[PDB]
Coordinates of C-alpha atoms (C1' of nucleotides) in Angstrom, one line a residue:
Chain A
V38 CA 34.8 -90.6 165.8
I39 CA 35.0 -92.1 169.5
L40 CA 33.3 -94.7 171.2
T41 CA 32.6 -95.2 175.4
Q42 CA 31.9 -97.9 177.5
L43 CA 32.5 -97.5 181.3
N44 CA 35.1 -100.2 183.1
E45 CA 34.2 -101.7 186.3
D46 CA 36.0 -99.4 188.1
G47 CA 33.9 -96.0 186.9
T48 CA 36.9 -95.7 184.4
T49 CA 36.4 -95.5 180.5
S50 CA 37.9 -96.7 177.4
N51 CA 37.5 -94.7 175.0
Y52 CA 37.6 -96.6 170.7
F53 CA 38.7 -95.0 168.5
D54 CA 39.8 -95.4 164.1
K55 CA 44.1 -94.4 164.3
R56 CA 43.4 -93.8 161.1
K57 CA 41.1 -91.3 161.0
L58 CA 41.3 -89.4 165.3
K59 CA 45.3 -88.5 165.8
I60 CA 45.4 -88.2 170.0
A61 CA 48.2 -87.6 171.2
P62 CA 51.2 -90.2 172.3
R63 CA 50.1 -89.5 176.0
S64 CA 46.6 -89.3 176.4
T65 CA 45.0 -90.6 178.8
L66 CA 42.5 -91.7 176.4
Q67 CA 45.9 -94.6 174.7
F68 CA 44.3 -96.1 178.2
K69 CA 40.9 -98.4 177.6
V70 CA 40.6 -102.3 178.7
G71 CA 41.2 -104.4 175.3
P72 CA 39.4 -107.7 175.0
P73 CA 38.2 -110.3 177.5
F74 CA 40.3 -113.7 177.8
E75 CA 38.4 -117.2 177.7
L76 CA 39.6 -120.1 178.9
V77 CA 41.7 -122.9 176.6
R78 CA 42.0 -125.9 177.9
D79 CA 42.9 -127.1 181.8
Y80 CA 46.1 -128.6 181.9
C81 CA 47.5 -130.3 184.8
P82 CA 46.0 -131.1 188.2
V83 CA 47.6 -129.7 190.9
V84 CA 46.8 -130.8 194.8
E85 CA 48.4 -129.8 198.7
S86 CA 50.4 -131.8 199.4
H87 CA 48.9 -133.3 203.0
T88 CA 45.6 -133.1 202.6
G89 CA 44.4 -134.7 199.1
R90 CA 42.9 -131.3 198.1
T91 CA 42.3 -129.7 194.9
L92 CA 43.5 -126.9 193.8
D93 CA 41.3 -124.8 192.1
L94 CA 43.0 -122.0 190.3
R95 CA 41.9 -119.6 187.5
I96 CA 44.3 -116.6 185.2
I97 CA 42.4 -113.9 185.9
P98 CA 43.9 -111.5 182.5
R99 CA 42.2 -108.4 180.9
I100 CA 44.6 -105.6 178.1
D101 CA 44.7 -101.8 179.3
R102 CA 46.8 -100.3 176.4
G103 CA 47.0 -101.4 172.9
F104 CA 43.2 -102.2 171.4
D105 CA 40.4 -100.6 170.3
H106 CA 37.1 -102.3 170.0
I107 CA 36.4 -100.8 165.3
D108 CA 32.9 -102.4 163.6
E109 CA 33.1 -105.4 166.2
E110 CA 36.5 -106.3 165.5
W111 CA 39.8 -105.1 168.7
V112 CA 42.7 -103.3 166.7
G113 CA 45.8 -103.0 167.4
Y114 CA 49.2 -100.8 165.9
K115 CA 52.3 -102.9 165.2
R116 CA 53.8 -99.4 166.1
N117 CA 52.8 -98.6 169.8
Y118 CA 52.5 -100.0 172.9
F119 CA 50.0 -102.7 174.4
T120 CA 50.0 -103.8 178.7
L121 CA 48.2 -107.1 179.4
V122 CA 48.4 -107.6 182.7
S123 CA 47.4 -110.5 184.7
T124 CA 47.3 -112.3 187.8
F125 CA 45.8 -116.0 189.3
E126 CA 43.5 -116.9 192.1
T127 CA 42.3 -120.2 194.1
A128 CA 39.1 -120.3 194.6
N129 CA 38.4 -120.9 198.6
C130 CA 41.7 -121.1 199.8
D131 CA 43.2 -117.8 201.1
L132 CA 46.4 -116.6 201.0
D133 CA 48.4 -117.2 204.0
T134 CA 47.0 -120.1 203.8
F135 CA 48.8 -121.4 200.4
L136 CA 51.8 -120.3 201.0
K137 CA 52.4 -122.3 204.3
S138 CA 51.4 -125.1 202.3
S139 CA 52.7 -127.2 200.0
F140 CA 51.4 -128.6 196.2
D141 CA 52.2 -131.0 194.0
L142 CA 50.8 -132.2 190.5
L143 CA 48.8 -135.2 189.6
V144 CA 50.1 -136.1 186.9
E145 CA 49.2 -139.7 186.4
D146 CA 46.3 -141.0 188.7
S147 CA 46.7 -143.5 191.8
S148 CA 50.2 -143.9 192.2
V149 CA 50.8 -141.6 195.1
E150 CA 54.3 -142.2 194.3
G151 CA 53.7 -140.9 190.7
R152 CA 53.6 -136.8 191.7
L153 CA 56.1 -133.7 191.1
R154 CA 56.0 -132.0 193.6
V155 CA 55.3 -127.8 192.2
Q156 CA 58.7 -125.0 193.3
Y157 CA 56.2 -121.9 192.3
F158 CA 53.1 -121.0 190.1
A159 CA 54.4 -118.6 187.4
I160 CA 52.6 -116.5 184.4
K161 CA 53.6 -116.9 180.7
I162 CA 52.7 -114.6 177.4
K163 CA 52.3 -115.8 173.6
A164 CA 51.0 -114.2 170.6
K165 CA 49.9 -116.5 168.0
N166 CA 47.8 -116.9 165.1
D167 CA 45.6 -117.9 165.6
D168 CA 44.1 -119.5 162.7
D169 CA 46.8 -122.4 162.0
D170 CA 48.1 -121.9 166.3
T171 CA 52.0 -120.5 164.0
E172 CA 53.6 -118.7 167.4
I173 CA 54.3 -114.8 166.5
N174 CA 57.4 -113.5 168.3
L175 CA 56.9 -109.5 171.3
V176 CA 59.3 -107.6 171.9
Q177 CA 59.0 -105.7 175.1
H178 CA 61.0 -102.3 175.5
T179 CA 61.7 -100.0 179.1
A180 CA 60.5 -96.5 179.1
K181 CA 63.8 -95.4 177.3
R182 CA 62.4 -97.6 174.7
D183 CA 65.0 -97.3 171.6
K184 CA 68.2 -95.9 174.3
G185 CA 67.3 -99.5 176.7
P186 CA 67.2 -102.2 175.8
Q187 CA 65.0 -104.8 174.3
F188 CA 63.3 -108.2 175.9
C189 CA 61.0 -111.0 174.9
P190 CA 58.3 -111.5 177.8
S191 CA 59.7 -112.9 180.3
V192 CA 58.2 -115.6 183.1
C193 CA 57.0 -114.3 185.4
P194 CA 56.7 -116.5 189.4
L195 CA 53.9 -115.1 190.7
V196 CA 51.4 -116.0 193.7
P197 CA 47.6 -115.4 193.5
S198 CA 46.3 -112.0 194.3
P199 CA 43.4 -110.1 193.1
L200 CA 43.8 -107.9 189.5
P201 CA 44.5 -104.5 190.6
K202 CA 41.5 -102.0 188.9
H203 CA 42.2 -100.6 185.0
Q204 CA 42.8 -97.1 187.5
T205 CA 45.4 -99.1 189.9
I206 CA 47.5 -100.1 186.3
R207 CA 47.3 -96.5 184.8
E208 CA 48.4 -94.8 187.8
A209 CA 51.5 -97.2 188.6
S210 CA 52.8 -96.7 184.3
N211 CA 55.4 -94.7 184.9
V212 CA 56.5 -93.7 188.6
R213 CA 60.1 -93.0 189.2
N214 CA 59.4 -91.7 192.7
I215 CA 60.5 -93.3 195.7
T216 CA 56.8 -92.2 198.3
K217 CA 54.6 -93.4 194.8
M218 CA 56.8 -96.4 194.6
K219 CA 56.2 -97.5 198.0
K220 CA 52.5 -96.3 197.7
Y221 CA 51.7 -99.1 194.5
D222 CA 54.9 -101.7 196.8
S223 CA 52.3 -103.8 198.4
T224 CA 49.4 -103.6 195.4
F225 CA 52.1 -105.6 193.4
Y226 CA 54.5 -107.4 194.8
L227 CA 55.2 -109.5 198.1
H228 CA 58.2 -109.4 200.2
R229 CA 59.2 -112.8 201.4
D230 CA 61.8 -111.6 203.6
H231 CA 59.3 -109.1 205.4
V232 CA 57.5 -112.4 206.7
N233 CA 58.1 -114.0 210.1
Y234 CA 60.3 -116.6 209.4
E235 CA 59.3 -118.2 212.3
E236 CA 56.5 -119.1 211.1
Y237 CA 57.5 -121.7 207.7
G238 CA 57.8 -125.4 207.0
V239 CA 62.0 -125.8 204.6
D240 CA 59.1 -127.0 202.7
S241 CA 56.7 -124.4 202.0
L242 CA 55.9 -123.4 199.0
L243 CA 56.5 -119.6 199.5
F244 CA 60.3 -120.7 200.3
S245 CA 60.9 -123.0 197.0
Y246 CA 60.0 -120.1 195.1
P247 CA 63.6 -118.9 193.6
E248 CA 64.1 -114.5 194.5
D249 CA 62.8 -112.8 197.5
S250 CA 61.0 -109.9 195.4
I251 CA 57.5 -112.0 193.8
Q252 CA 55.2 -110.6 191.1
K253 CA 51.5 -110.7 193.0
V254 CA 50.4 -109.6 189.5
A255 CA 52.1 -110.6 186.3
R256 CA 52.6 -107.7 184.1
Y257 CA 53.5 -106.4 180.9
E258 CA 54.3 -103.1 180.3
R259 CA 55.2 -101.6 177.1
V260 CA 54.9 -105.4 174.6
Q261 CA 54.1 -105.2 170.6
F262 CA 55.0 -107.3 167.7
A263 CA 58.5 -107.6 166.2
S264 CA 59.1 -105.0 164.0
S265 CA 59.4 -108.3 161.1
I266 CA 55.7 -109.8 161.4
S267 CA 53.2 -109.1 158.5
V268 CA 50.2 -108.7 159.5
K269 CA 47.9 -109.5 156.1
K270 CA 47.7 -113.2 153.8
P271 CA 48.7 -113.1 150.5
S272 CA 44.7 -113.1 149.9
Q273 CA 45.7 -109.1 151.4
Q274 CA 43.3 -110.2 153.9
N275 CA 44.2 -109.9 157.2
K276 CA 45.9 -112.3 159.3
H277 CA 44.4 -112.9 162.8
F278 CA 46.0 -112.7 165.8
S279 CA 45.2 -114.2 169.1
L280 CA 46.7 -112.7 172.7
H281 CA 47.8 -115.9 175.0
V282 CA 47.6 -116.1 179.3
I283 CA 49.7 -119.5 180.3
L284 CA 49.5 -120.1 184.0
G285 CA 53.0 -123.0 184.9
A286 CA 53.8 -124.5 187.5
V287 CA 57.8 -124.9 187.5
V288 CA 58.8 -128.5 188.5
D289 CA 62.9 -129.7 188.9
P290 CA 63.0 -131.7 186.1
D291 CA 65.1 -134.8 188.1
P298 CA 56.4 -136.8 180.7
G299 CA 53.7 -137.6 178.8
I300 CA 52.2 -133.5 179.2
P301 CA 52.8 -130.3 177.9
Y302 CA 55.7 -128.4 179.6
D303 CA 58.3 -126.0 178.0
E304 CA 61.6 -126.1 179.2
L305 CA 63.0 -123.0 181.7
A306 CA 66.3 -121.4 182.6
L307 CA 66.7 -122.5 186.8
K308 CA 68.3 -120.1 189.1
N309 CA 70.2 -123.1 189.7
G310 CA 71.2 -123.1 186.2
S311 CA 69.7 -126.5 185.9
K312 CA 66.7 -127.1 182.9
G313 CA 63.5 -125.9 184.5
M314 CA 59.9 -127.5 183.3
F315 CA 57.1 -124.8 183.1
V316 CA 54.6 -127.5 183.3
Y317 CA 50.9 -126.3 181.3
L318 CA 48.0 -125.7 184.4
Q319 CA 45.8 -123.4 181.7
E320 CA 46.0 -120.9 179.4
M321 CA 43.7 -118.4 178.0
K322 CA 43.3 -116.8 174.7
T323 CA 42.0 -113.7 173.6
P324 CA 39.5 -113.2 170.7
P325 CA 40.9 -112.7 167.1
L326 CA 43.4 -109.6 167.4
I327 CA 43.9 -107.3 163.4
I328 CA 47.2 -105.1 163.5
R329 CA 47.5 -102.6 161.0
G330 CA 51.0 -102.5 159.8
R331 CA 53.4 -99.0 159.7
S332 CA 51.7 -98.3 156.4
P333 CA 50.6 -94.4 156.1
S334 CA 47.0 -95.4 155.4
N335 CA 46.8 -96.7 158.5
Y336 CA 47.6 -93.4 160.2
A337 CA 44.9 -89.7 159.9
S338 CA 47.7 -88.5 158.7
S339 CA 47.7 -89.3 155.1
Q340 CA 43.7 -88.7 155.3
Chain B
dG1 C1' 60.2 -103.9 153.9
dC2 C1' 63.1 -102.7 158.4
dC3 C1' 66.0 -99.6 161.1
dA4 C1' 67.1 -95.6 163.0
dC5 C1' 66.1 -90.9 164.4
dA6 C1' 62.9 -87.3 164.7
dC7 C1' 59.0 -84.4 165.5
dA8 C1' 55.9 -83.2 169.9
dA9 C1' 52.6 -83.5 173.1
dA10 C1' 51.3 -84.4 177.6
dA11 C1' 52.2 -87.2 182.0
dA12 C1' 55.6 -87.5 186.3
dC13 C1' 57.6 -85.3 189.9
Chain C
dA1 C1' 55.7 -73.8 187.6
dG2 C1' 59.5 -75.5 186.3
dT3 C1' 62.2 -79.2 183.6
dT4 C1' 62.5 -84.3 182.6
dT5 C1' 59.8 -88.4 179.9
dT6 C1' 57.5 -91.0 178.1
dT7 C1' 55.1 -92.7 173.4
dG8 C1' 52.5 -92.1 169.2
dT9 C1' 54.0 -91.2 164.7
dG10 C1' 56.8 -88.2 160.5
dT11 C1' 60.8 -89.8 157.9
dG12 C1' 65.0 -90.7 155.6
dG13 C1' 68.0 -94.2 154.3
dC14 C1' 68.7 -98.5 152.0

DNA sequence: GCCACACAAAAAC
DNA sequence: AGTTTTTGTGTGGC
């Protein structure tokens, strides 16, 4: 009934079928590692503005709630939350140096004056129909759920960091207590206002981030597929979905390559230029039908 | 079919 | 050692 896999940090993922077994909403059994991500592609190269060193980048994503590995399929439920977290890394490039440096997008080689300055790096997530690439709406809630606002996942400015262990994501999922919040603060945030400003040049990457509080980890919790999504094909076969994580550089718009428009802080129209994208294997999503639940048995 | 509210069980404190 | 919070899911109204 429950199939158990050991996670990297020594916790367990316990996969079960909600058609057959009902477990309490707050049981630690609802936390589990979801499907592994795979590279879709790399997009625009990034170089350091002084040395010309190519910045090697890697997205490091994980799903920590909402998906079970059942009979060689990954299965989620329309009605329930999932959690998707991600960081990125810059191999052989330490954070302290990275933040003092500045970076350009190489849109065209052999054009030293043909480079856009990166203001900051950021992640976004998307859901798609894995068979035809059509995008599917995601919705997020606060902990208050219906007694609070609903919103679409947003673009998250981030600095490179190791991805926290599964247990750490669990532990930080519903922290209100001030003392405990402080314990986790250095894991999830870089507070630019707390650095020694004298160590930084005006053009440094750190000081082109939009806000003083900068995330180290993109944490998308309490996410759902929109309640209007059709989860079956007309043939009654299951639709296959995929979750995508995209790392981008935000630049000033002042374009033959992939990008999305972004509403900037100063009001103008930023550009989120794609750098790398990863995706999950195909996902099945079970709808609200009573037959998807053990109560029907 | 999608919404709104309802119940309840374990986490959080 | 209690009370509040959070979230899977049962249910009714249109």
